[PDB]
Amino acid sequence: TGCGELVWVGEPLTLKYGVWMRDPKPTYPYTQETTWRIDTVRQVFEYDLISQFGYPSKVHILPRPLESTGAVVYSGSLYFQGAESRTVIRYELNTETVKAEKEIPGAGYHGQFPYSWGGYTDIDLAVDEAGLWVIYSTDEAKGAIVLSKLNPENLELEQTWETNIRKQSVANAFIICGTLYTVSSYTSADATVNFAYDTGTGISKTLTIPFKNRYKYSSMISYNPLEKKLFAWDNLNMVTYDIKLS
Numbered sequence: 001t002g003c004g005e006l007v008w009v010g011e012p013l014t015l016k017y018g019v020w021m022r023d024p025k026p027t028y029p030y031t032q033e034t035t036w037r038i039d040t041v042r043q044v045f046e047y048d049l050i051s052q053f054g055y056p057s058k059v060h061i062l063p064r065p066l067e068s069t070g071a072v073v074y075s076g077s078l079y080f081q082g083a084e085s086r087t088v089i090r091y092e093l094n095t096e097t098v099k100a101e102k103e104i105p106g107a108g109y110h111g112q113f114p115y116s117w118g119g120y121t122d123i124d125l126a127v128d129e130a131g132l133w134v135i136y137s138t139d140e141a142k143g144a145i146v147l148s149k150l151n152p153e154n155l156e157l158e159q160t161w162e163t164n165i166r167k168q169s170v171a172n173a174f175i176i177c178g179t180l181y182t183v184s185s186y187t188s189a190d191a192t193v194n195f196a197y198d199t200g201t202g203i204s205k206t207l208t209i210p211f212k213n214r215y216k217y218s219s220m221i222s223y224n225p226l227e228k229k230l231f232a233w234d235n236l237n238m239v240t241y242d243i244k245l246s
């Protein structure tokens with residue numbers, strides 16, 4: 001099958017070191033060999049070719065800085081969180097136009113609901129086989145992970161789920177085939193995928209899938225559904241994790 005439940009994660013493989021991003025729904029005039037780099041934060045460097053990816057073909061200046069590296073490129077736009085805000089911005093790359101701005105309702109930001117190793121990781125953007133998502137929490141949710149499916153055109157919240165896991169108790173989270181998975185570790189860098197919440201059914205469960213992790217750091221993890229792989233940035237290297245689905 002093409003989608004399924006996660007059953008295995010591979011070892012992280014190391015791939016201007018980052019943060020690199022690719023579009024899982026490449027849209028002309030961009031292609032699959034188009035790459036974007038966020039400098040680690042207001043400039044986005046664009047590389048048309050993988051060959052040129054070693055000088056940029058274009059440099060974009062964003063209307064405001066990024067809060068964190070938890071941005072995504074999707075269907076020709078950069079989606080990111082504005083610094084010191086709970087606002088998600090859609091920046092169309094080819095036209096250099098802000099096409100949508102949205103306050104995530106009630107979302108904590110700037111150190112209210114970080115992941116377990118901290119940083120400004122309150123709000124994360126994600127892409128899976130069904131499109132664009134945002135992962136966050138609210139005071140009403142008492143720090144539980146909330147996830148919302150976003151309309152990529154106008155950033156309306158098409159559907160929201162309040163899950164039964166505490167955001168500050170997990171090191172990271174990512175969405176694959178409509179299921180939210182969390183990564184948890186008590187005191188070791190190494191960890192486990194310890195929880196799954198299936199947005200198709202509302203059913204959640206505790207898991208024990210090994211998840212190898214190099215640092216006690218709130219990494220940027222970005223699932224790429226086009227490649228069916230996880231990409232991650234640990235402040236030093238871009239890495240990729242292979243996955244297996246049932």
Ligand code: NA
Nearest residue numbers: 124220221222
């Ligand atoms: Na992420």
